[PDB]
Design a binder for this molecule. Structure first.
Ligand SMILES: CC(C)C1C(=O)n2ncc(C#N)c2N=C1c1cnn(CCN(C)C)c1
Ligand SMILES: [Mn+2]
Ligand SMILES: [Mn+2]
Ligand SMILES: [Mn+2]
Ligand SMILES: [Zn+2]
Length: 452
């Protein structure tokens, strides 16, 4: 027996409200961040054109078994037509019904039954990948000859290709290769194909658009309940919490929302239909499944609101020895170096994060100096491959500074883990720093000036 969570908030902005996506999100944040997810119905006039030949679109399917609490990684060939045909026949055969006459309530109820049952070993398939020449964005991009209809949506703020380059997303300024993160993912779904409970890398927002097809069912949990949900999962599925060698290597799972609700974790649901958006807020857990054959597109993004949470996330990561996707501080400094061309509100928020960064860095350098580290040299960390600049203990990506030691060449620790590097005496250690405090304070003041 399954009891559907309460519905999450649904917004129907006017064209005036809908115009600027970042302003609209900021306005709904008070409501939506209490539920973790929300749904956005664009004005009826807003309808981006979906033109597509299902025979030339091809992708490699991924296979998925559907067992509650079973571990899954978060890491053959179909055309969109053959997949679609496979998907419809599956659902149609499973229920002995036309795919559209099966109620969403029923598919939901059936999903939670089959993932629970040991006897059932339903496997399904799906597509998940970054856009490519074999399978491109569902939104119009610049390239062949576009219709005027297509051209109209080229520059839309809700065209998800545009989010990795809007200034209001601080992830745009990142000049590092983080393709997995800042580029939109494309998802081809069939009935029961499922995304396990997770939050986004670095606690970022995400936004998801269902282009066409049968709906996508979501479950969302507000950011404030994140560790509570983690406690419940740690008690019921500990194998998901054994630490992992690489970032692609995260274990996740399917878990009945009722189980979370039973343990006082607030959960909300929704059915995302074609032409609707779902937005997930920072550190809001979500999961769900598809009702049938469909096509979605999704991307992460980071508003100014997020910057302090961004800093908190990386400290988390340090404590948990989890790898980082990028350096938060390296991003902060990149923005500071372009203060003159920053949006004024952005510059203000960045300045505030940078002040915390600098006083924290000050204290850490005083601490390592009292541990006997005397020698130092400037080091351009941004030039090192990421796997070449992780703290050997906590795996954090170094940028502001690190300690090295001649006794163990090429190894680094962050300044929280000076004691974890070599067993040589302190004078053989070196402080590697990107900037001096004297370098940093003017960078921060440029941001201050820019913000008046
Ligand atoms: C079933 C699949 C096409 C799919 C999907 O439809 N969605 N829709 C939203 C999300 C998210 N977050 C999302 N994520 C999906 C997805 C990716 N990677 N994986 C593999 C591991 N996953 C179960 C967490 C599933
Ligand atoms: Mn099962
Ligand atoms: Mn997600
Ligand atoms: Mn530790
Ligand atoms: Zn460390």
């Amino acid at each position: 027996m399954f009891l559907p969570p309460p519905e999450c908030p649904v917004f129907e902005p006017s064209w005036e409200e809908f115009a600027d996506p970042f302003a609209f999100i900021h306005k709904i944040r008070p409501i939506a961040e209490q539920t973790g997810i929300c749904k956005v119905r664009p004005p009826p006039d807003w309808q981006p054109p979906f033109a597509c030949d299902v025979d030339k679109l091809h992708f490699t399917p991924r296979i998925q078994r559907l067992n509650e609490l079973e571990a899954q990684t978060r890491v053959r060939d179909y055309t969109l037509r053959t997949f679609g045909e496979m998907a419809d026949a599956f659902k149609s055969d499973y229920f002995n019904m036309p795919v559209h006459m099966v109620p969403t309530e029923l598919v939901e109820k059936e999903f939670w039954r089959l993932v629970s049952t040991i006897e059932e070993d339903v496997t399904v398939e799906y597509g998940a990948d970054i856009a490519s020449k074999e399978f491109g964005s569902g939104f119009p991009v610049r390239d062949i000859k576009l219709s005027p209809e297509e051209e109209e949506y080229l520059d839309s703020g809700w065209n998800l290709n545009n989010m990795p380059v809007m200034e209001q997303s601080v992830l745009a300024h990142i000049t590092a290769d983080i393709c997995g993160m800042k580029l939109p993912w494309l998802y081809v779904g069939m009935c029961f194909s499922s995304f396990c409970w997770h939050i986004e890398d670095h606690w970022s927002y995400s936004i998801n658009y269902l282009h066409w097809g049968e709906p996508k069912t979501w479950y969302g949990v507000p950011g404030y309940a994140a560790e509570q949900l983690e406690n419940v999962m740690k008690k019921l599925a500990p194998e998901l919490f054994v630490s992992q060698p690489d970032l692609l290597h995260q274990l996740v799972t399917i878990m009945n929302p009722n189980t979370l609700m039973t343990h006082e974790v607030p959960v909300y649901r929704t059915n995302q239909c074609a032409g609707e958006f779902v937005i997930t807020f920072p550190r809001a857990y979500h999961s769900g499944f598809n009702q049938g054959f469909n096509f979605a597109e999704a991307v992460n993004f980071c508003t100014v609101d997020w910057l302090p949470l961004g800093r908190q996330c990386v400290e988390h990561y340090r404590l948990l020895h989890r790898y980082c996707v990028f350096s938060h501080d390296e991003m902060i400094c990149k923005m500071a170096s372009k203060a003159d061309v920053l949006d004024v509100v952005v510059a203000s928020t960045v300045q505030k994060d940078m002040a915390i960064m600098i006083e924290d860095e000050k204290a850490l350098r005083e601490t390592v100096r009292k541990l006997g580290v005397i020698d130092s040299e400037r080091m351009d960390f941004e030039l090192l491959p990421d796997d070449e600049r992780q703290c050997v203990k906590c795996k954090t990506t170094c940028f502001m500074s690190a300690i090295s030691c001649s006794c163990k060449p090429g190894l680094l620790v962050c300044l929280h883990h000076v004691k974890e590097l070599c067993s040589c005496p302190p004078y053989k250690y070196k402080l590697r720093y990107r900037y001096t405090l004297d370098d940093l304070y003017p960078m921060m003041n440029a941001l201050k000036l820019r913000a008046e």
